[PDB]
Design a protein around this ligand. Sequence first.
Ligand SMILES: CC1(C)Cc2cccc(C(N)=O)c2O1
Length: 209
Amino acid sequence: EVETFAFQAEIAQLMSLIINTFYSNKEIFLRELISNSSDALDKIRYESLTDPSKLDSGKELHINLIPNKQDRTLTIVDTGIGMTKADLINNLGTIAKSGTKAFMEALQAGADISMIGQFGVGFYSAYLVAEKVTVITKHNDDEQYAWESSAGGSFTVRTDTGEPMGRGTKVILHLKEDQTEYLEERRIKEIVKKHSQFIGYPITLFVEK
Ligand SMILES: CC1(C)Cc2cccc(C(N)=O)c2O1
């Protein structure tokens, strides 16, 4: 059973701008997703300071980057607080509706796409290089769910039946045909040491054989 939702108009215009605007510094998407993972890890570690039972679903707090050249996917796995069905559907979009409006005002005032993180909408920068984004998350107070959208103005949410995660968020980027450079081991290295060198959690790059 899969439910299909319609993106808010402001968010839908933000993504379509991201995919269609000719912008060459697309490497900033990894900095935002890693920063999003660092925020999720800061939350779950902060809640465990007054409730250590929240870490029963996992004590390790790390970020994993798993490129796959066969499936043409780049995966970012973090063990943060996770996301609920209300967060995936509403809530998070309500928070981002103001950051989107302010972002589109700043692009016309001189700012570029690289400043998308300063508005709290840095996740949508994933569509700079991905034609389809799948999100698998697990929150301590909800079931495992699957978020998916190929832009177009709509997204789907369903209960995940795959391998359980315990807690955290898995972001799977189905990369575009011309963005396969972000699956190379030395390209992901350059981006991490240049953009996410000061993250307070271990960022492990999974190499392929
Ligand atoms: C930018 C934001 C925090 C809002 C939002 C809504 C739905 C999914 C995500 C995400 N997958 O990071 C998301 O990240």
